[PDB]
Design a protein around this nucleic acid. Structure first.
Ligand SMILES: Nc1ncnc2[nH]cnc12
Ligand SMILES: Nc1ncnc2[nH]cnc12
Lengths: 338, 338
DNA sequence: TACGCAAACGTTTGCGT
DNA sequence: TACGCAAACGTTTGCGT
């Protein structure tokens, strides 16, 4: 079809190409006509064709887990923002922690010849790690590991452990000593990681958390509801609770209200993520904030580096969580005794 | 690189191709070797190359507005689900209601040669309609219009008006006659549409809504907070409020709590959307539910039809909202008098 | 000076035999 | 019977002149 344009303009396609890509000098005169034709012909340069010669599609694939969950959602939108301004095209794929689904999208991606790969799989078993490696050839970065699980990728690490530790400390310094927790899937970094961080703070305080006070969640509002319930649904209950994620917390808030418990007057709740609208939780959620934007930006960045500056050596960049004081927590019984 | 495979197997690439695509019969023997090589060579058929001959990329572009907002998010995830199972690749682009941004993504899309186009732009001014038409050639469907704005697209219509009407009716039948409303951007269908529907119910009831009781929102939690405030922040206030979107409502809930108002005992609130987690609002939100999944499914479907069955004539498919009773509403002063 | 030729990028596919 | 040839799809780009 460029052939069709070169003709209208009565010049070589090479020429057409050159003016389209400003890749060498062209007569104004000449230039014009081409555009002229480019317009009537209503021309649209085929990227697939181009991508065929130039050897880069100028698009990146997001091998995600899910994309609705507030958390995930924020990141994605971030990453995308980046792709847009640097000319990249985002190909979004949720794998739902389904291996087949993952091997699937992966290969679809390779075939669509993605310039690079962003990875947010939540859980990383050997079987997944393995598949992953078969694609080392294609530049990639995993945005959700605690440490550097592999040598073939760039990694961005959130410090979820120091975040767990922060959340715990706060409780302590507020007077709390009877504290429960609803962690997220221990196979995930944001799960095991955050929890552990929180658990260290307790040991430092010689605070023991009775097993009946820790209930697993999965990050979905419902998981929180159940746990919160289960916790306050017992003879003896904590005076403060640490919730591994904002949404689940939102779930733990609802349930307390429903058991007619008061927050924070009856129970104190600290969450984790600081999702765009935790502020509008009732009451306004006190939580640890994860820098989701920077997280995305930093991932798309390391990736571009590898891409353009053809880097070979794996990289890894830390990012830092931080406490956000809201209205869901209140001084515990030992505040004044410290 | 297929050339590299044909060689290992010592057969024609045509052959390699044939066994890869099961496009004609091949000796088991022959078949094997190819795979054999296909494996060692660690081969990955280039879709760009293929897409070049076959003339279809097997990917669809989502020209969205935003992708974080719960609403949007749910849809997208839906649509994507569909693309995955029918082999399509999703290219997601948020235009933020920025014309340039839109013309941009659009053309990027055309160039990436998308098999079809899904459109969720929120607002549609002539300038946007116009650009849009320049792409009639590429099959497309707009998932957020009230009626059929154009003749060159397939449309799926939500019936947001009948939804507004439903929400109003409910209030009425619950005993309410003093009711306020926080609508969303009147330029959007889910804005003007829903409101109007609600407004008809009032006229039918000879209920007049004083201007001081209607406050625009933008769908973001914050907009709701302000409005809710503004409303209850007056000498005379409604006994019930209709909120154009769940998130904003969530915002209107927070504010009441903060002005120490009780919901629903002090104010009744009905929202709109029934987002995945409105159930976990505090209190559990009573709202109108939009079938977001079916919405996506139905869009990806009409689109596939056009695509595959090369349809030419625009189509349009209705979808229906429905009331979801929760805990945010309570009988008003006239319940017993009817 | 300002431009055009033709090979190449990696596939699929109509004819053949 | 089971397979191979070669043209084509739409670009970019190293040489030329
Ligand atoms: N996997 C996950 N899902 C939702 N919110 C999260 N916060 C941290 N990890 C998360
Ligand atoms: N544009 C929009 N944003 C968020 N929620 C919505 N519900 C209906 N339309 C919406």
């Amino acid at each position: 079809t460029i052939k069709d344009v070169a003709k209208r303009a009565n010049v070589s396609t090479t020429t057409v190409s050159h003016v389209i890509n400003k890749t060498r000098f062209v007569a104004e005169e000449t230039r014009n006509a081409v555009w002229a034709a480019i317009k009537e012909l209503h021309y649209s340069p085929s990227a697939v064709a181009r991508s065929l010669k130039v050897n880069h599609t100028k698009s990146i694939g997001l091998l995600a887990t899910s994309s609705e969950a507030a958390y995930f959602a924020e990141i994605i939108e971030a990453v995308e923002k980046n792709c847009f301004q640097k000319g990249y095209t985002l190909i979004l794929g949720n794998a739902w922690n389904n291996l087949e689904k993952q091997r699937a999208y992966l290969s679809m991606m390779a075939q669509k010849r993605v310039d690079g790969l962003l990875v947010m799989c939540s859980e990383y078993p050997e079987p997944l790690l393995a598949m992953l490696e078969e694609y080392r050839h294609i530049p990639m970065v995993v945005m959700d590991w605690g440490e550097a699980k592999a040598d073939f990728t760039d990694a961005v690490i959130d410090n979820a452990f120091e975040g767990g530790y922060m959340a715990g400390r706060y409780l302590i310094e507020r007077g709390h000593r009877e504290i429960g927790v609803i962690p997220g899937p221990l196979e995930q970094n944001t799960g095991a990681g955050r929890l552990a961080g929180f658990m260290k703070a307790m040991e430092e305080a010689m605070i023991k958390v009775p097993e009946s006070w820790i209930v697993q969640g999965d990050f979905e509002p419902e998981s929180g509801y159940r746990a919160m319930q289960q916790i306050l649904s017992q003879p003896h209950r904590p005076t403060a609770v640490f919730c591994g994620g904002d949404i689940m917390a939102m779930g733990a808030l609802c349930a307390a209200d429903e058991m007619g418990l008061r927050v924070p007057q009856d129970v104190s709740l600290i969450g984790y993520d600081n999702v765009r609208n935790a502020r509008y939780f009732t009451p306004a959620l006190t939580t640890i904030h994860q820098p989701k934007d920077s997280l995305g930006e930093t991932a798309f960045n390391m990736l571009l580096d590898r891409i353009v500056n053809k880097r070979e050596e794996p990289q890894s960049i830390e990012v830092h969580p931080r406490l956000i004081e809201r209205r869901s927590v209140a001084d515990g019984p030992f505040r004044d005794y410290r």
